């Protein structure tokens, strides 16, 4: 075999009788999940992987763009055109999508437990499809993904380069419980256990020191950007939540008597910037009742400030908004090859 790319196909446990919008897209666009998935380990093979230059990600992105453009029904779409249209509420909950190769190709998988995502990989295996990956589109925090098997893993195309996005892969997930209560209708909030979070964040920080000399590590809020990225942003049950994460990135509470329950303020927005293409989209207001979803914080998107090498510190601010990086955080241990 050798490295090469080819149009992949998808596969999911999705139902034709479901109103839910991922299922509906999956019904006409993917096949059923592999009813007997087989993994054969390749003995004594060493293989080079690069999660940052992987065509799989571009393809998963293309799907999710298509998925969203077909699924979400904004009242008003804006680009110079203003489009006004039917915007009934939809049920929205992502499901696992798998990505598979056609004939003559196979997907290599890296099983080195401490694999960062660029090196060689010494425990390589071949699959026919990936595992099941939820297409969660959030910023700042990665939600509802896989976990790192052993230590916490810092992932970057190059860490000394401040233009490169950083992916933290947690080895212990942490709950985030976001609720809009019944029944001020756009006012909402998330809760995270102070003690777990702050424990996990101190380990992230310990890991960042290993990468950055023994340079003192600090977090700060984002310096700027659109709302989608200055806030932790995500979709629960069709509603677009925007949540202030100032209190999650608190390096005072790295003694003291401080942890408790950390509650982030949120609000549900109707006018958002579209992640797929150009402009804005206005949505209907929130449905009545308890709007809730409990997600697992499983990774963190960071950017590191530039202009700091003549200095004692490194500063890390939560980021993302390049959704492709959300796919990378799950696809990193895969790569397609061609045979002969």
């Amino acid at each position: 075999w050798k490295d090469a790319d080819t149009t992949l196909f998808c596969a999911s446990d999705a139902k034709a009788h479901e109103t839910e919008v991922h299922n509906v897209w999956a019904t006409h666009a993917c096949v059923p999940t592999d009813p007997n998935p087989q993994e054969i380990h390749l003995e004594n093979v060493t293989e080079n992987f690069n999660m940052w230059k992987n065509n799989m990600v571009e393809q998963m992105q293309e799907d999710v763009i298509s998925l969203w453009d077909q699924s979400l029904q904004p009242c008003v779409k804006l680009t110079g055109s203003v489009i006004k249209q039917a915007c009934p509420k939809i049920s929205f909950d992502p499901i696992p999508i798998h990505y598979c190769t056609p004939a003559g190709y196979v997907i290599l998988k890296c099983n080195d437990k401490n694999f960062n995502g660029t090196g060689p990989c010494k425990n390589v295996s071949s699959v026919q499809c990936t595992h099941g990956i939820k297409p969660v589109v959030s910023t700042q925090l990665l939600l509802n993904g896989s976990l790192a098997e052993e230590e916490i893993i810092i992932r970057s195309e190059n860490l000394t380069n401040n233009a490169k996005t950083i992916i933290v892969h947690l080895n212990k997930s942490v709950e985030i419980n976001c609720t809009r209560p019944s029944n001020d209708i756009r006012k909402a909030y998330c809760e995270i256990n102070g003690t777990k979070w702050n424990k996990v964040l101190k380990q992230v920080t310990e890991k960042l020191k290993e990468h950055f000399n023994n340079k003192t590590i600090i977090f700060q809020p984002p310096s700027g950007g659109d709302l989608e990225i200055t806030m932790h942003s995500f979709n629960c049950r069709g509603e677009f939540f925007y949540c202030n994460t100032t209190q999650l990135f608190n390096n005072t509470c790295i003694m003291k008597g401080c942890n408790g329950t950390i509650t982030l303020p949120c609000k549900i927005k109707q006018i958002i910037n579209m992640w797929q293409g150009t402009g804005q989209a206005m949505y209907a207001p929130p449905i009545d009742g308890k709007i809730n979803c409990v997600s697992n914080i499983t990774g963190i998107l960071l950017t590191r400030d530039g202009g700091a090498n003549n200095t004692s510190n490194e500063t890390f601010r939560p980021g993302g908004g390049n959704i492709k990086d959300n796919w990378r955080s799950e696809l990193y241990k895969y790569k397609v090859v061609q045979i002969e």
């Epitope: 000394t160 380069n161 401040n162 700027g224 989608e228 090498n309 908004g321």
Partner: antibody, heavy 120, light 96 residues
Framework: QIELVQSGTEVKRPGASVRISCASS????????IHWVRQAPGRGLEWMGW????????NYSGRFQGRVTMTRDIYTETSFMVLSGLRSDDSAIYFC?????????????WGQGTLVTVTA | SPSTLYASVGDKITITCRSS????KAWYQQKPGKAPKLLIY???ILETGVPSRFIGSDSGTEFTLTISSLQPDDFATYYC?????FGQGTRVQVRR
């Protein structure tokens, strides 16, 4: 014609802010970072920070920081750099530039530059 | 290294910067009252339109701009780049 065109010469009082524009044409605006870089008669070229036009994300130099805000308008393909609490110190020529991926192949092209002089 | 460098039309010259880390180094030329122009990216790749007399090399922790035959236009200031950080600047001047 891939190009960057900046706004003109500024004379600002000590304490004031400047707003410099940087208009893009000839390429897919959201695909390339914009960097700002100054030439102060004294200190070669100094990077001030980067801005990702996709979503407005920024990375500012600590050496300035607080004082620089970088924003863009996707519809006019124009980027903006506000430097605040100006000092004599900040008298310089200010350049926008296109980071081709955003340091890897870059910086090209550059704006013609914008002179800012800080005087009473 | 260093701020001024003196040479004749037609000489080979080398401009050197040094860095702890890697990777990709770039090189810029600037003339008075003008923006910097990109010469070399990825340590050794010519930007299209730039004369092939401009050569970029990179031996790990030390990287260089060579001008294999100095032309009158080449008397100017040269900046090295490594991510955000720039060299002090080397002014190439007429030797006498």
């Amino acid at each position: 014609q891939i190009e960057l065109v900046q706004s003109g010469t500024e004379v600002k009082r000590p304490g004031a802010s400047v707003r410099i524009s940087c208009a893009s044409s000839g390429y897919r605006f959201t695909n390339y970072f914009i960097h700002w870089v100054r030439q102060a008669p004294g200190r070669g070229l100094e990077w001030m920070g980067w801005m990702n036009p996709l979503h407005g994300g920024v990375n500012y130099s600590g050496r300035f920081q607080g004082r620089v805000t970088m924003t863009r308008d996707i519809y006019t393909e124009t980027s903006f750099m506000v430097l605040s609490g100006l000092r004599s110190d900040d008298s310089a020529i200010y350049f926008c530039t296109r980071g081709r991926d955003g340091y890897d192949d870059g910086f090209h092209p550059w704006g013609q530059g914008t002179l800012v002089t800080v005087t009473a | 290294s260093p701020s001024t460098l003196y040479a004749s039309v037609g000489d080979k010259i080398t401009i050197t910067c040094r860095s702890s880390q890697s990777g990709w180094k770039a090189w810029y030329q600037q003339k008075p009252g003008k923006a910097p122009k990109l010469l070399i990216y990825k340590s050794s790749i010519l930007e299209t339109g730039v004369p092939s007399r401009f050569i970029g090399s990179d031996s790990g922790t030390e990287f260089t701009l060579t001008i294999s035959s100095l032309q009158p236009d080449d008397f100017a200031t040269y900046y090295c780049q490594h991510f955000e950080t720039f060299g002090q600047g080397t002014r190439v001047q007429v030797r006498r």
